Amino acid sequence: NSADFLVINKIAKAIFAVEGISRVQAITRPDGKPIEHTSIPFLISMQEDSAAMGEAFDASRNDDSFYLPPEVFDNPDFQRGLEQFLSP
Amino acid sequence: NSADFLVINKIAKAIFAVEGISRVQAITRPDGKPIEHTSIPFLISMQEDSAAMGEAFDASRNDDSFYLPPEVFDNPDFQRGLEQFLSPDGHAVRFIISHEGDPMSQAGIARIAKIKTAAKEAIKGTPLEGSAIYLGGTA
Amino acid sequence: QLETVGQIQAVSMSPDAAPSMISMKHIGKVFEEGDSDSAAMIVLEGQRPLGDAAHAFYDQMIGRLQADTTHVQSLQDFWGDPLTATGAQSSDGKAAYVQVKL
Amino acid sequence: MIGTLKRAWIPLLILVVVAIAGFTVQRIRTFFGS
Ligand SMILES: CCCCCCCCCCCCCCCCCC(=O)O[C@@H](COC(=O)CCCCCCCCCCCCCCC)COP(=O)(O)OCCN
């Protein structure tokens, strides 16, 4: 559920913040890089400049915010990775 | 560019969070205090409730979130500060760090490795990863 | 006398292999501001908050300092620029400073 | 032979001391900077 994926991303970042750790890989971060289009300007959405903020927050792989809407759990492109990371 | 200023602000914060460090000074923090109009109530920009929020985030120097539009690299009153902190070809940024107590004590000298480690872990996982980190000074 | 030769032939305090000396030389080179380790801090303090005459005198001072190419290699203004001005000024406003690379 | 190495035990001890010291010194000379 979208409620517990916030805690999952929190655990991922808290583990990544350990000193000798590089490349933590989780469902909210399936390649050591945060999921695109989940950052802070993508939970917000004069428009071409906001699309610039959108790409500035993804060209830095920023992860200070993350939502991942609850209608991605039914996307078929998600289940093959959701079965690798979460229990059946 | 707007993308690599997020990482610059991330490094500035990660250094400012070291123990005996006070007053870190970066391009995204030109006087040890964050740039106004860059926190979260301005990324969201009826208004009288969204103006008081922006004014409460500007009166607290809150800089958890940060954005500086690409409209500031051509701002003619920003280049004299952009030349001080970024290399003339933009390939290197510099931060000016101050200590709390005595820089040349036994603790102000043990803080040097910690500054380097903080700056190194700040660029981990970002497009600036692998950059060279040089720390000069007197401590 | 021995002291004259000792003052002529003075040697650096830090080795060339010191990571801090490497770092300081590299920082000075990349920013096109000299290859030294020396740096002085011209502090100017006023018994009352520094005003416009203070800024005029400070502008004159940095002008006189930059002109001497023989000894002054650079200086970070930070006070002649309103964007960074408050970064070179005390909280009460009675003191300001400027770093000069020698 | 043991009979002749105990008329030259002082230069031998000096050699072994100088060798150990020189190796330790050239080893410690490398720590700084690195
Ligand atoms: C800061 C550096 C310190 C490093 C060195 C620490 C000390 C090391 C001590 C090693 C001792 C080796 C010297 C052995 C002396 C052997 C004496 C000898 O060969 O001749 C004497 C023979 O007398 C004996 O019977 C001695 C036979 C016993 C030798 C056995 C060696 C004992 C080793 C002691 C181990 C201590 C090692 C400590 C290491 C930390 C008499 O000869 P001479 O009167 O004609 O010579 C004088 C004129 N030049």
Short mmCIF file of C-alpha atoms and ligand atoms in Angstrom, two decimals:
data_model
loop_
_atom_site.label_atom_id
_atom_site.label_comp_id
_atom_site.label_asym_id
_atom_site.label_seq_id
_atom_site.Cartn_x
_atom_site.Cartn_y
_atom_site.Cartn_z
CA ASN A 1 0.00 0.00 0.00
CA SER A 2 1.16 3.55 -0.60
CA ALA A 3 1.20 4.14 3.16
CA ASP A 4 3.88 1.56 3.97
CA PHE A 5 5.99 2.31 0.90
CA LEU A 6 6.91 5.59 2.57
CA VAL A 7 8.39 3.66 5.49
CA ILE A 8 10.09 1.34 3.00
CA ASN A 9 11.73 4.28 1.23
CA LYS A 10 12.66 5.64 4.65
CA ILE A 11 14.45 2.40 5.53
CA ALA A 12 16.18 2.43 2.15
CA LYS A 13 17.51 5.95 2.66
CA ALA A 14 18.46 5.30 6.29
CA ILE A 15 20.52 2.31 5.19
CA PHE A 16 22.05 4.27 2.32
CA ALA A 17 23.16 6.90 4.85
CA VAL A 18 25.52 4.44 6.57
CA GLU A 19 29.11 5.42 5.89
CA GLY A 20 30.53 2.49 3.97
CA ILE A 21 27.36 1.67 2.03
CA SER A 22 26.86 2.33 -1.66
CA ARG A 23 24.06 1.08 -3.91
CA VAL A 24 21.17 0.06 -1.73
CA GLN A 25 18.48 -1.52 -3.91
CA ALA A 26 14.83 -1.63 -2.87
CA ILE A 27 11.37 -1.59 -4.43
CA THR A 28 11.15 2.19 -4.15
CA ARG A 29 14.68 2.35 -5.58
CA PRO A 30 14.95 -0.66 -7.87
CA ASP A 31 18.40 0.20 -9.22
CA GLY A 32 20.13 2.09 -6.43
CA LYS A 33 18.68 5.29 -8.01
CA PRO A 34 15.36 6.72 -6.81
CA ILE A 35 12.29 6.18 -8.96
CA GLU A 36 11.75 8.99 -11.44
CA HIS A 37 8.60 11.12 -11.25
CA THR A 38 8.10 10.52 -7.52
CA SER A 39 10.06 13.53 -6.25
CA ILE A 40 8.73 16.69 -4.58
CA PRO A 41 7.57 18.54 -7.75
CA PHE A 42 5.65 15.48 -8.97
CA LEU A 43 3.40 15.36 -5.92
CA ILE A 44 2.72 19.07 -6.46
CA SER A 45 1.29 18.68 -9.98
CA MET A 46 3.99 28.90 -15.62
CA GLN A 47 3.99 25.28 -16.75
CA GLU A 48 7.10 25.11 -18.95
CA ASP A 49 9.05 26.47 -15.98
CA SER A 50 7.49 23.89 -13.65
CA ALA A 51 8.47 21.16 -16.12
CA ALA A 52 11.98 22.56 -15.61
CA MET A 53 11.77 22.03 -11.85
CA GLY A 54 10.52 18.53 -12.63
CA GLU A 55 13.64 17.69 -14.63
CA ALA A 56 16.00 19.46 -12.22
CA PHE A 57 14.69 17.28 -9.39
CA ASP A 58 15.16 14.16 -11.54
CA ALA A 59 18.51 15.09 -13.09
CA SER A 60 19.88 15.19 -9.52
CA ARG A 61 18.16 11.90 -8.55
CA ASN A 62 16.79 13.78 -5.54
CA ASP A 63 14.96 11.58 -3.04
CA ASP A 64 13.93 13.96 -0.24
CA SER A 65 10.32 13.28 -1.26
CA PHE A 66 8.52 10.22 -2.57
CA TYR A 67 4.86 9.34 -3.03
CA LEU A 68 4.34 6.64 -5.70
CA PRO A 69 0.51 6.80 -6.07
CA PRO A 70 -1.58 3.81 -4.93
CA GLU A 71 -2.66 2.95 -8.45
CA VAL A 72 0.78 1.63 -9.41
CA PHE A 73 0.19 -1.65 -7.55
CA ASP A 74 -2.04 -2.71 -10.47
CA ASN A 75 0.40 -1.73 -13.22
CA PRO A 76 1.61 -4.92 -14.97
CA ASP A 77 5.05 -3.35 -15.46
CA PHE A 78 5.38 -3.31 -11.66
CA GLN A 79 4.46 -6.81 -10.52
CA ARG A 80 7.61 -8.55 -11.76
CA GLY A 81 9.67 -6.22 -9.56
CA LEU A 82 7.19 -6.24 -6.70
CA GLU A 83 7.47 -10.03 -6.51
CA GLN A 84 11.26 -9.82 -6.29
CA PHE A 85 11.23 -7.42 -3.34
CA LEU A 86 8.07 -8.04 -1.33
CA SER A 87 6.95 -11.36 0.05
CA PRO A 88 4.24 -13.17 -1.93
CA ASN B 1 22.66 24.52 -13.79
CA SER B 2 19.56 24.01 -11.68
CA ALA B 3 20.21 20.27 -11.41
CA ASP B 4 23.67 20.47 -9.84
CA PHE B 5 22.69 23.23 -7.41
CA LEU B 6 20.49 20.71 -5.58
CA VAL B 7 23.59 18.61 -4.98
CA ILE B 8 25.54 21.71 -3.99
CA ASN B 9 22.92 22.56 -1.38
CA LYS B 10 22.94 18.94 -0.24
CA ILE B 11 26.71 19.14 0.33
CA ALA B 12 26.36 22.45 2.15
CA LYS B 13 23.75 21.00 4.51
CA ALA B 14 25.70 17.78 5.06
CA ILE B 15 28.74 19.81 6.05
CA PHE B 16 26.75 22.20 8.24
CA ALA B 17 25.50 19.13 10.12
CA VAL B 18 28.99 18.25 11.37
CA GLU B 19 29.39 18.81 15.10
CA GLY B 20 31.69 21.75 15.71
CA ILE B 21 30.86 23.36 12.37
CA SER B 22 28.99 26.64 12.37
CA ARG B 23 28.44 29.05 9.49
CA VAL B 24 28.99 27.10 6.30
CA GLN B 25 28.89 29.43 3.31
CA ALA B 26 28.03 28.29 -0.22
CA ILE B 27 26.49 29.72 -3.37
CA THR B 28 23.13 28.35 -2.25
CA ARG B 29 23.79 29.88 1.17
CA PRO B 30 25.74 33.03 0.39
CA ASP B 31 25.95 34.34 3.96
CA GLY B 32 25.68 31.18 6.04
CA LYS B 33 21.89 31.69 5.85
CA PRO B 34 19.83 30.04 3.09
CA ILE B 35 18.60 32.00 0.09
CA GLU B 36 15.13 33.37 0.68
CA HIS B 37 12.21 32.32 -1.56
CA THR B 38 13.64 28.82 -2.14
CA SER B 39 11.89 26.69 0.49
CA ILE B 40 8.77 24.56 -0.01
CA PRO B 41 5.99 27.22 0.10
CA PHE B 42 7.61 28.76 -3.00
CA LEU B 43 7.97 25.55 -5.00
CA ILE B 44 4.17 25.39 -4.67
CA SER B 45 3.84 28.78 -6.37
CA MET B 46 -6.28 32.37 -1.85
CA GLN B 47 -2.79 33.74 -1.27
CA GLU B 48 -3.29 35.14 2.24
CA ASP B 49 -2.91 31.59 3.60
CA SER B 50 -0.11 30.64 1.18
CA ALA B 51 1.72 33.93 1.84
CA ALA B 52 1.80 33.49 5.61
CA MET B 53 3.21 30.00 5.04
CA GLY B 54 6.00 31.32 2.83
CA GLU B 55 6.69 34.06 5.39
CA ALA B 56 6.86 31.52 8.22
CA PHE B 57 9.31 29.46 6.16
CA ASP B 58 11.39 32.58 5.41
CA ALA B 59 11.41 33.79 9.04
CA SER B 60 12.80 30.42 10.17
CA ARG B 61 15.53 30.02 7.52
CA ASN B 62 14.03 26.61 6.80
CA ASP B 63 15.95 24.97 3.97
CA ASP B 64 14.95 21.31 4.08
CA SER B 65 13.72 21.69 0.51
CA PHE B 66 15.33 24.01 -2.01
CA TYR B 67 14.95 25.10 -5.63
CA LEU B 68 16.63 27.89 -7.57
CA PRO B 69 15.17 28.36 -11.08
CA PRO B 70 17.39 28.42 -14.18
CA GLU B 71 16.47 32.12 -14.28
CA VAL B 72 19.27 32.99 -11.84
CA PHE B 73 22.29 32.11 -14.00
CA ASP B 74 21.46 35.03 -16.29
CA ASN B 75 20.39 37.32 -13.44
CA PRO B 76 23.00 40.11 -13.70
CA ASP B 77 23.16 40.59 -9.92
CA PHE B 78 24.04 36.95 -9.29
CA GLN B 79 27.16 36.55 -11.41
CA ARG B 80 29.44 38.38 -8.99
CA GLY B 81 28.51 35.77 -6.39
CA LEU B 82 28.58 32.94 -8.88
CA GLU B 83 32.19 33.73 -9.75
CA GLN B 84 33.30 33.55 -6.11
CA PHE B 85 31.96 30.07 -5.44
CA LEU B 86 32.18 28.30 -8.80
CA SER B 87 35.23 27.91 -10.98
CA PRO B 88 35.29 30.17 -14.06
CA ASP B 89 34.30 27.14 -16.15
CA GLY B 90 31.91 25.93 -13.46
CA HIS B 91 33.70 22.62 -12.97
CA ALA B 92 34.42 23.20 -9.27
CA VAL B 93 32.40 24.66 -6.41
CA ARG B 94 33.82 25.75 -3.07
CA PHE B 95 32.38 26.05 0.43
CA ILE B 96 33.77 28.25 3.21
CA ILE B 97 33.54 26.56 6.59
CA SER B 98 33.86 28.09 10.07
CA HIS B 99 34.34 26.29 13.37
CA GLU B 100 32.61 26.89 16.69
CA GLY B 101 35.37 26.80 19.27
CA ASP B 102 39.09 26.88 18.61
CA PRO B 103 39.98 25.71 15.08
CA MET B 104 43.48 24.69 16.18
CA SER B 105 42.55 22.66 19.24
CA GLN B 106 42.58 18.87 19.34
CA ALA B 107 38.90 18.80 18.34
CA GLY B 108 39.06 21.39 15.58
CA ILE B 109 41.71 19.19 14.00
CA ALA B 110 39.73 15.99 14.44
CA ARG B 111 36.88 17.75 12.62
CA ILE B 112 38.80 17.86 9.34
CA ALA B 113 38.38 14.19 8.50
CA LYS B 114 34.73 14.51 9.48
CA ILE B 115 34.22 17.44 7.11
CA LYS B 116 35.79 15.44 4.30
CA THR B 117 33.65 12.40 5.11
CA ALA B 118 30.46 14.46 5.25
CA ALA B 119 31.20 16.08 1.90
CA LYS B 120 32.03 12.67 0.44
CA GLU B 121 28.83 11.00 1.62
CA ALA B 122 26.79 13.96 0.40
CA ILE B 123 27.70 13.29 -3.25
CA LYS B 124 27.28 9.52 -2.94
CA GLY B 125 24.57 8.35 -5.30
CA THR B 126 24.37 11.72 -7.09
CA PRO B 127 25.69 12.68 -10.54
CA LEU B 128 28.62 14.39 -8.78
CA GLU B 129 29.77 11.07 -7.34
CA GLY B 130 33.46 10.48 -7.86
CA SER B 131 34.38 14.16 -7.80
CA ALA B 132 37.63 15.14 -6.13
CA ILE B 133 37.28 16.72 -2.70
CA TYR B 134 40.01 19.15 -1.64
CA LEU B 135 40.03 20.61 1.86
CA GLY B 136 42.48 23.42 2.49
CA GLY B 137 42.59 25.78 5.41
CA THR B 138 44.56 26.27 8.58
CA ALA B 139 43.21 23.48 10.78
CA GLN C 1 75.41 37.32 10.54
CA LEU C 2 73.61 34.01 10.97
CA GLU C 3 70.21 35.64 11.41
CA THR C 4 70.41 37.53 8.12
CA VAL C 5 71.09 34.31 6.22
CA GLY C 6 68.39 32.54 8.22
CA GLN C 7 65.86 35.20 7.29
CA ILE C 8 66.93 35.11 3.63
CA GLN C 9 66.75 31.31 3.45
CA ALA C 10 63.49 30.64 5.23
CA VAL C 11 61.64 27.45 4.33
CA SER C 12 57.92 26.70 4.25
CA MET C 13 56.12 25.45 7.35
CA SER C 14 54.31 22.65 5.53
CA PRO C 15 55.71 20.15 3.02
CA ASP C 16 54.67 20.00 -0.60
CA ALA C 17 53.29 16.51 0.04
CA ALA C 18 50.93 17.72 2.75
CA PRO C 19 47.36 17.09 1.53
CA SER C 20 46.39 20.51 2.87
CA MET C 21 49.10 22.22 0.85
CA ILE C 22 48.14 20.23 -2.24
CA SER C 23 44.52 21.20 -1.64
CA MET C 24 45.25 24.88 -1.08
CA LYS C 25 47.43 25.14 -4.18
CA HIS C 26 44.79 23.36 -6.26
CA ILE C 27 41.97 25.53 -4.93
CA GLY C 28 43.96 28.67 -5.66
CA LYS C 29 44.85 27.47 -9.14
CA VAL C 30 41.38 26.35 -10.22
CA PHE C 31 39.90 29.66 -9.14
CA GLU C 32 42.76 31.63 -10.76
CA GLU C 33 43.80 33.33 -7.55
CA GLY C 34 47.36 32.48 -6.67
CA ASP C 35 49.52 29.54 -5.60
CA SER C 36 50.18 30.37 -1.95
CA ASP C 37 49.04 29.39 1.52
CA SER C 38 49.17 32.86 3.05
CA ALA C 39 46.03 34.87 3.70
CA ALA C 40 45.38 37.88 5.91
CA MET C 41 42.06 39.21 7.17
CA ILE C 42 41.62 42.97 7.05
CA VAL C 43 39.04 43.43 9.78
CA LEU C 44 37.50 46.87 10.13
CA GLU C 45 35.53 47.51 13.31
CA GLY C 46 33.35 50.50 14.14
CA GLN C 47 32.03 51.62 17.51
CA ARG C 48 28.68 52.22 15.77
CA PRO C 49 27.13 50.18 12.93
CA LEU C 50 29.10 50.50 9.70
CA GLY C 51 27.37 52.88 7.29
CA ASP C 52 27.93 54.30 3.83
CA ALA C 53 31.16 56.14 4.63
CA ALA C 54 32.43 52.78 5.87
CA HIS C 55 31.54 51.21 2.52
CA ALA C 56 33.20 54.05 0.61
CA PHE C 57 36.39 53.68 2.64
CA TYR C 58 36.21 49.90 2.19
CA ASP C 59 35.84 50.25 -1.57
CA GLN C 60 38.84 52.59 -1.63
CA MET C 61 40.76 50.12 0.52
CA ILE C 62 40.13 47.10 -1.69
CA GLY C 63 40.98 49.25 -4.69
CA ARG C 64 44.34 50.17 -3.17
CA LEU C 65 44.92 46.54 -2.18
CA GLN C 66 44.13 44.97 -5.57
CA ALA C 67 46.41 47.43 -7.37
CA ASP C 68 49.52 46.09 -5.62
CA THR C 69 50.27 43.08 -7.83
CA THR C 70 53.60 42.34 -6.12
CA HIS C 71 52.18 41.12 -2.79
CA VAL C 72 48.37 40.95 -2.95
CA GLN C 73 47.39 38.01 -5.14
CA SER C 74 43.60 38.15 -4.69
CA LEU C 75 40.83 39.05 -2.28
CA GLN C 76 37.28 37.82 -1.72
CA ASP C 77 35.09 40.91 -1.52
CA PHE C 78 31.84 39.43 -0.18
CA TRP C 79 30.94 42.86 1.21
CA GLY C 80 30.95 44.96 -1.92
CA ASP C 81 28.22 42.66 -3.24
CA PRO C 82 24.75 43.02 -1.68
CA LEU C 83 23.96 39.35 -2.35
CA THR C 84 26.80 38.14 -0.11
CA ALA C 85 27.22 41.33 1.94
CA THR C 86 25.74 39.92 5.15
CA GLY C 87 28.29 37.11 4.98
CA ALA C 88 31.09 39.55 5.79
CA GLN C 89 29.43 41.42 8.64
CA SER C 90 28.79 40.80 12.31
CA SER C 91 25.28 40.25 13.63
CA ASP C 92 25.22 43.65 15.34
CA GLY C 93 26.70 45.24 12.22
CA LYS C 94 29.67 46.86 13.94
CA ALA C 95 32.38 44.80 12.22
CA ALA C 96 33.23 43.56 8.74
CA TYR C 97 36.19 41.78 7.19
CA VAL C 98 37.80 40.76 3.91
CA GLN C 99 40.25 37.95 3.21
CA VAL C 100 43.33 38.79 1.14
CA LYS C 101 45.51 36.12 -0.42
CA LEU C 102 49.19 37.01 -0.21
CA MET D 1 83.41 -20.53 11.97
CA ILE D 2 82.65 -19.32 15.50
CA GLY D 3 86.24 -18.60 16.56
CA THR D 4 86.65 -15.75 14.11
CA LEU D 5 83.18 -14.23 14.29
CA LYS D 6 83.78 -13.47 17.97
CA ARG D 7 86.71 -11.19 17.26
CA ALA D 8 84.43 -9.19 14.95
CA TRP D 9 81.25 -9.27 17.02
CA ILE D 10 81.17 -5.49 17.51
CA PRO D 11 81.10 -4.62 13.78
CA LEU D 12 78.55 -7.39 13.20
CA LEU D 13 76.28 -6.09 15.96
CA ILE D 14 76.69 -2.59 14.54
CA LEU D 15 75.69 -3.83 11.09
CA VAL D 16 72.57 -5.60 12.34
CA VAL D 17 71.52 -2.60 14.44
CA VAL D 18 72.11 -0.14 11.60
CA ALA D 19 70.24 -2.40 9.17
CA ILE D 20 67.18 -2.80 11.39
CA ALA D 21 67.16 0.93 12.11
CA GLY D 22 67.56 1.88 8.46
CA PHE D 23 64.76 -0.41 7.34
CA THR D 24 62.45 0.91 10.06
CA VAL D 25 63.32 4.50 9.13
CA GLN D 26 62.75 4.03 5.40
CA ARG D 27 59.47 2.35 6.30
CA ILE D 28 58.30 5.20 8.54
CA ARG D 29 59.34 7.82 5.98
CA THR D 30 56.43 6.66 3.80
CA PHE D 31 53.54 7.11 6.24
CA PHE D 32 53.24 10.89 5.90
CA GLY D 33 51.37 12.15 2.86
CA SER D 34 50.75 8.69 1.39
C1 LIG E 1 68.46 0.45 20.28
C2 LIG E 1 69.09 -0.68 19.47
C3 LIG E 1 69.25 -1.92 20.35
C4 LIG E 1 69.45 -3.17 19.48
C5 LIG E 1 70.49 -4.10 20.11
C6 LIG E 1 69.97 -4.67 21.43
C7 LIG E 1 71.04 -5.52 22.11
C8 LIG E 1 71.29 -6.78 21.29
C9 LIG E 1 72.17 -7.74 22.09
C10 LIG E 1 72.65 -8.88 21.19
C11 LIG E 1 73.87 -9.56 21.82
C12 LIG E 1 74.78 -10.07 20.70
C13 LIG E 1 76.24 -9.84 21.09
C14 LIG E 1 76.89 -11.18 21.40
C15 LIG E 1 78.23 -10.94 22.08
C16 LIG E 1 79.07 -12.20 21.96
C17 LIG E 1 80.35 -12.01 22.75
C18 LIG E 1 81.49 -12.62 21.95
O1 LIG E 1 81.25 -13.11 20.91
O2 LIG E 1 82.81 -12.61 22.42
C19 LIG E 1 82.95 -12.75 23.80
C20 LIG E 1 82.81 -14.21 24.19
O3 LIG E 1 82.22 -14.32 25.45
C21 LIG E 1 81.18 -15.25 25.51
O4 LIG E 1 81.38 -16.33 25.95
C22 LIG E 1 79.79 -14.87 25.02
C23 LIG E 1 79.09 -16.10 24.43
C24 LIG E 1 77.58 -15.91 24.51
C25 LIG E 1 77.05 -15.25 23.24
C26 LIG E 1 75.57 -15.59 23.08
C27 LIG E 1 74.80 -14.38 22.57
C28 LIG E 1 73.72 -14.03 23.59
C29 LIG E 1 72.60 -13.22 22.95
C30 LIG E 1 71.86 -12.43 24.03
C31 LIG E 1 70.40 -12.25 23.61
C32 LIG E 1 69.92 -10.83 23.93
C33 LIG E 1 69.16 -10.30 22.72
C34 LIG E 1 68.27 -9.12 23.12
C35 LIG E 1 67.51 -8.63 21.89
C36 LIG E 1 66.55 -7.50 22.27
C37 LIG E 1 84.34 -12.25 24.17
O5 LIG E 1 85.00 -11.83 23.01
P1 LIG E 1 86.17 -10.67 23.13
O6 LIG E 1 86.46 -10.42 24.59
O7 LIG E 1 87.42 -11.15 22.44
O8 LIG E 1 85.67 -9.28 22.41
C38 LIG E 1 85.96 -8.06 23.05
C39 LIG E 1 86.92 -7.22 22.21
N1 LIG E 1 86.24 -6.69 21.05
#
